[PDB]
Amino acid sequence: ATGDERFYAEHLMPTLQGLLDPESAHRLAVRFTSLGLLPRARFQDSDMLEVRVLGHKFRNPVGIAAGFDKHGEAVDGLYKMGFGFVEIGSVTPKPQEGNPRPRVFRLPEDQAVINRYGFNSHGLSVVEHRLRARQQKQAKLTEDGLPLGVNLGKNKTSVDAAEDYAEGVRVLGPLADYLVVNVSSPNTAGLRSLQGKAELRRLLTKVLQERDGLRRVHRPAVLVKIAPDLTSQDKEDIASVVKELGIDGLIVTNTTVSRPAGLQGALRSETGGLSGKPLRDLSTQTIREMYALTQGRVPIIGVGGVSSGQDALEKIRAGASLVQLYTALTFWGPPVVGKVKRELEALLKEQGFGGVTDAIGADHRR
Ligand SMILES: Cc1cc2nc3c(=O)[nH]c(=O)nc-3n(C[C@H](O)[C@H](O)[C@H](O)COP(=O)(O)O)c2cc1C
Ligand SMILES: Cc1cc(NC(=O)c2c(O)nn3ccccc23)c(C(C)C)cc1Oc1ccncc1
Ligand SMILES: O=C(O)c1cc(=O)[nH]c(=O)[nH]1
């Protein structure tokens, strides 16, 4: 309800965030979500929100982005809050602790977060066993239109980046509906340089060879997640490699190392990736560019600063088939998920679209 949204947004979450620093709050949220405990959200998804892409049906196009459930501990609880799909990770091959604390910062006056977690990860083996313990349950959820994505990273000290990603394909590929090759974290030395043309072609050739070697019912789609901070040359190169190799999709975008003019939060000059509202339109414009460079033929998951139905529809009209959110959940709590879906349905009807599918890329056809 708007009453439930208001209680969370004006009383419960402001109070808890005043008592808990963001990393402690994040850990408590994941732990609590994993317990189930809470009933499924009220909103009932209508037919016009269904999307068929990446070889799967999505009951609604609003997902939880990577980095909230880094280790696969709260998947079922996230479906209960109404997300149409869940992405876990990033997961590294070996366990690692990430950067020293403090490493997460809130910018309440900007509705933004800065983080430098550094790929803290339980590692592939632990996550593999966690997902195996619910693998058949996930198979039924996927069949019912609730797919699962797994986001892969690399270890800090690894010498061969491509072998780190290949290991992730072999270990978690068989448990995923789609895999994400995350070459865009700002918080690992040298990672984003994997976005260049030659490095990217060789890396993605190896990743796709590994994927194709899996048995057919265990063969996921493969997407690449890119930064919002790329040059025009970088974007044309990514688009060329994606089409050359047959990559299945793109996730647009990760956090930004830029600091837009106008930020007010005291913590705006901390090192790390910036998320939330100051990222929104930079991400939407990157979606627009990548859709055009790929001729509308490559599915895009749009992410960055989504907290309303209007935010979601703007990314869909720019070229996204699905959207994700994270930072808005940390400020407004679970009710934001139903709010986005309710507003999106109303806007689709007001703008004369028969459903989400009809609106994908519509800005490009004006
Ligand atoms: C605290 C935090 C941790 C994140 N960790 C990851 C990660 O491990 N892997 C990844 O691909 N993206 C990660 N992200 C990026 C989000 O998936 C998303 O791309 C970005 O935050 C923009 O969406 P938002 O504005 O709705 O938060 C993280 C973001 C935040 C805020
Ligand atoms: C959904 C949610 C999230 C959060 N908090 C965070 O996840 C959080 C934060 O506050 N800052 N932050 C910065 C970077 C990354 C994450 C975060 C909290 C805190 C305030 C306790 C409560 C939540 O309510 C729930 C959870 C589970 N079941 C029902 C209701
Ligand atoms: O530090 C991380 O783990 C991290 C942060 C972020 O914003 N994006 C990402 O891919 N990783």
DSSP 47-99: GGG-EEETTEEESSSEEEPTTSSTTSSSHHHHHHTT-SEEEEEEE-SS-B--S
Do 52 and 58 meet the contact criterion of CB atoms below 8 Å apart? yes
CA distances from 290 to 7, 296, 297 (A): 39, 8, 10
CA distance 338 to 211: 35
Nearest CA to 169 out of 154, 158, 187 is that of: 154
Structure tokens at 30: 């994941």
The residue type found at 119 is F
Half-sphere exposure of 26 (CA within 13 A, CB side): 17
- Ligand 2 within 6 A of CB of 328: no
Half-sphere exposure of 264 (CA within 13 A, CB side): 5
- Ligand 1 within 6 A of CB of 303: yes
- Ligand 2 within 6 A of CB of 337: no
* Structural domains of the chain, with CATH: 1-366 (3.20.20.70)
Do 184 and 226 meet the contact criterion of CB atoms below 8 Å apart? yes
Structure tokens at 132: 């195996």
Half-sphere exposure of 314 (CA within 13 A, CB side): 16
CA distance 227 to 215: 32
Do 296 and 361 meet the contact criterion of CB atoms below 8 Å apart? yes
Q: What number of other Cβ atoms are within 10 A of residue 101's Cβ?
A: 10
Do 299 and 54 meet the contact criterion of CB atoms below 8 Å apart? yes
Q: Give the full edge-to-edge strand order of the sheet including 273-276.
A: 104-107, 112-115, 273-276
Active site residue 185: yes
Q: Which of 70, 90, 104 to mutate to test the pocket of ligand 3 (most atoms within 8 A of CB)?
A: 90
- Ligand 3 within 6 A of CB of 26: no
User: What sign does the dihedral 340-260-180-327 (CA atoms) show?
Assistant: negative
The phi and psi torsions of 58 (rounded to 5 degrees) equal: -115, 120
Asked whether residue 60 is marked as a ligand-binding residue, the answer is: no
Q: Which ligand is nearest to the CA of 335?
A: 2
Crossing angle between the packed helical segments 161-172 and 197-212, to the nearest 10 degrees: 30
Q: Give the CA dihedral 354, 355, 360, 364, nearest 10 degrees.
A: 20
Do 49 and 328 meet the contact criterion of CB atoms below 8 Å apart? no
Structure tokens at 270: 């901390």
- At a CB cut-off of 8 Å and minimum separation 6, what does 325 contact? 62, 63, 64, 65, 303, 306, 307, 336, 337, 340
Count of H-run helices and E-run strands, the chain? 14, 13
Sequence-ordered alpha helix ranges (H) in 219-353:
232-245, 280-293, 309-318, 327-332, 335-350
Which pairs with CB-CB distance under 8 Å and at least 24 residues apart come from 227-230? 227/184, 227/186, 227/192, 227/195, 227/253, 227/254, 227/256, 228/252, 228/253, 228/254, 228/255, 228/256, 228/258, 228/279, 228/282, 228/283, 228/286, 228/304, 229/192, 229/256, 229/257, 229/258, 230/195, 230/286
Q: Which ligand is nearest to the CA of 20?
A: 2
Nearest CA to 79 out of 48, 34, 13, 22 is that of: 34
CA distance 157 to 68: 24
Structure tokens at 289: 């560019």
CA distance 170 to 35: 29
Q: Which ligand is nearest to the CA of 114?
A: 1
Do 152 and 182 meet the contact criterion of CB atoms below 8 Å apart? yes
Atom of ligand 1 lying closest to residue 254 CA: 19
Q: What number of other Cβ atoms are within 10 A of residue 135's Cβ?
A: 11
Nearest CA to 361 out of 117, 51, 101 is that of: 51
Do 332 and 307 meet the contact criterion of CB atoms below 8 Å apart? yes
Residue nearest to atom 19 of ligand 1 (CA): 254
Asked whether residue 90 is marked as a ligand-binding residue, the answer is: yes
Q: Which of 10, 15, 26, 81 to mutate to test the pocket of ligand 2 (most atoms within 8 A of CB)?
A: 26
Nearest CA to 63 out of 149, 172, 143 is that of: 149
Q: What number of other Cβ atoms are within 10 A of residue 108's Cβ?
A: 15
CA distances from 357 to 302, 310, 313, 353, 360 (A): 14, 16, 11, 9, 6
Q: Indicate the SS3 state at residue 249.
A: strand
> What is the CA 237 to chain-centroid distance, rounded?
22
- At a CB cut-off of 8 Å and minimum separation 6, what does 233 contact? none
- Ligand 3 within 6 A of CB of 309: no
Q: What number of other Cβ atoms are within 10 A of residue 143's Cβ?
A: 11
Q: Which of 223, 275, 286, 306 to mutate to test the pocket of ligand 1 (most atoms within 8 A of CB)?
A: 275
- Catalytic residue (one of 121, 158, 185, 283): 185
CA distance 155 to 361: 36
- At a CB cut-off of 8 Å and minimum separation 6, what does 297 contact? 243
CA distance 23 to 30: 11
- At a CB cut-off of 8 Å and minimum separation 6, what does 311 contact? 280, 305, 340
Nearest CA to 5 out of 344, 312, 337 is that of: 337
Q: Indicate the SS3 state at residue 106.
A: strand
